[PDB]
Design a protein around this nucleic acid. Sequence first.
RNA 1: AAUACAGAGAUCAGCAGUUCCCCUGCAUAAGGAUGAACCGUGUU
Length: 77
Amino acid sequence: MLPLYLLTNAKGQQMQIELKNGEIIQGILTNVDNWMNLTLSNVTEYSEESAAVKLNEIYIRGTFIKFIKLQDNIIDK
RNA sequence: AAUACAGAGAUCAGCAGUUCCCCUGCAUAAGGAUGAACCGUGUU
């Protein structure tokens, strides 16, 4: 299935975003749009994968994402 | 008129062309017959 559909239904799951600058964002997905802009709650962002700021909500532009690790649960969920 | 002469003086065959008439083609005119499952006012 399409990446976007996959995302739209991962709403409420936990996922890990790598940004183009190296920052890693662990959080629970709360919203997606057609340009893959995200909003996540219960957030922890890291300066790099080596690792630590906790944030309540984060908005991420989709053009800035290298990849998004999904929970293995994904296919059945 | 007398004479000199020279003195009795081609055939077999083919094709097209006019004239009507039939067969078969193509053209030009008019005429008809029948067949063809589909419907134009924010990433390069």
